[PDB]
Amino acid sequence: SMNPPPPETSNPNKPKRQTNQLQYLLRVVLKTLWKHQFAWPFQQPVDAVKLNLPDYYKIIKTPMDMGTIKKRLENNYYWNAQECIQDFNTMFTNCYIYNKPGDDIVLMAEALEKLFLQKINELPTE
Ligand SMILES: Cc1cc2ccnc(N[C@@H]3CCNC[C@H]3OCC3CCCCC3)c2[nH]c1=O
Secondary structure, eight states, X not given: OOSOOOOOSOOSSSOOOOOHHHHHIIIIIIHHXXXXXXXXXXXXXXXXXXXXXXXXXXXXXXXXXXXXXXHHHHTTOOSSHHHHHHHHHHHHHHHHHHSOTTOHHHHHHHHHHHHHHHHHHTOOXX
């Protein structure tokens, strides 16, 4: 049992809300990053068993990925946009911590982050 349980994508006790900013995050931000050519390694939790990365979850204690973010948006898990923005940042940060600088996966994350920040810059008013 080397993979941890994935991050939660629903919770009956966590208050839920539908807002235009959260809709924008799903329909524009996530959608754009999801279909990008570099998205696929970030589309699901890092599978340390299948990818043979035994030390991944020894190093990364706050895992996050776009598959989880997608589910959280679809399930109305978030109350606000900043929670979601934080999750994207966690995903990128993890990549920059675990992998050495100049690694292709880091360059991929950087391209996705650049695109992400552009779309967040264009976030609609509530
Ligand atoms: C999110 C994520 C996924 C991932 C998958 C596989 N391997 C990773 N780390 C490796 C560490 C050793 N150097 C090579 C790295 O993987 C190579 C990339 C090349 C581009 C396509 C994906 C695998 C991963 N690290 C992660 O942070």
